[PDB]
């Protein structure tokens, strides 16, 4: 597990908890900056800077968030329980409330167990799927007919994590802000994402 | 983009309100309220 | 200004300077978070990405 909360002894799992245990010095891995985690452990300044988007098929007349919540016609979900549905359950904003209204009535129908499966159902029905941006980009570079619609829907970033007054946590951040201007993360990220 | 960077708000070194602000600042971010804030002040 | 350091006697300016001097508690503009300025002042994370 990355790290959460429980919602009843208020106990951490995950990379977070070995954090605040001090089991670990680091946590290295796309560890998502968010209030809650920020109040518990110190991150590192993001590595990279991300939000949600639509992954859908490639050649339709399709632009944005809008034009999906204002229809019927093309389903759209997200994985179950992931990142993603959870910030369309809580959203107050319009469009996105709207989008959940759609989604948890036809729940069974569009929300996906998988990354996996929700790309099949891309490829394979009128079906738009809501995801991590990162995650996206790692699609369409290997999936040729696929593409991002629209923008961010939200903006998030992903740390390092360190416990809370670790020393390393600001030599950390300085080392990444050099790496950014160095050109040395835009690298890396097209090694490992380019198809 | 052809570079990454953010604005951010700044402290003294050693600020106690440093990591106050950025708690506050995800908070905005998750809930909503920034984006808000960036379509007030953006859109023509 | 900003903030930005004097290539020959390294010492600060702008929004920077004001905080490095405890002058001001926040400096709170669109100021970029870059190397050379978070290891002198400490950044919030950001509001904005860019
Ligand atoms: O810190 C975290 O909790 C997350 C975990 C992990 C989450 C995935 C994305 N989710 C995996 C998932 F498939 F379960 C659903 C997806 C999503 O919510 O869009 C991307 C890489 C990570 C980014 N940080
Ligand atoms: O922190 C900083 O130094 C800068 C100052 C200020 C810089 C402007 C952009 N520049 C103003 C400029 F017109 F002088 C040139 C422009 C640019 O470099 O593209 C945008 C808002 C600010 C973001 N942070």
């Not at 904003?93 to 499966?117: C, G, H, N, P």
């Not at 007919?145 to 951040?173: A, E, F, H, W």
């Amino acid at each position: 597990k990355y790290g959460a909360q429980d919602d009843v002894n208020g106990q951490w799992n995950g990379m977070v908890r070995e954090l605040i245990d001090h089991k670990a010095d680091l946590a290295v891995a796309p560890l998502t900056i968010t209030y809650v985690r920020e109040k518990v452990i110190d991150f590192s300044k993001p590595f990279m800077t991300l939000g949600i988007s639509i992954l859908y098929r490639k050649g339709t007349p399709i632009d944005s968030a809008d034009d999906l919540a204002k229809q019927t016609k093309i389903e759209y979900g997200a994985v179950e329980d992931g990142s993603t549905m959870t910030f369309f359950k809580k959203s107050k904003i319009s469009t996105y409330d709207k989008m959940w209204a759609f989604m948890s009535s036809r729940r069974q129908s569009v929300l996906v167990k998988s990354s996996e499966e929700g790309i099949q159902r891309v490829l394979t029905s009128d079906y738009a799927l809501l995801m991590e941006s990162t995650t996206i980009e790692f699609v369409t570079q290997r999936n040729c007919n696929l593409t991002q619609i629209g923008g961010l829907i939200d903006s998030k970033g992903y740390g390092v994590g360190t416990p809370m007054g670790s020393p390393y946590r600001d030599k950390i951040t300085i080392a990444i802000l050099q790496l950014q201007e160095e050109g040395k993360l835009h690298m890396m990220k097209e090694k490992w994402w380019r198809g």
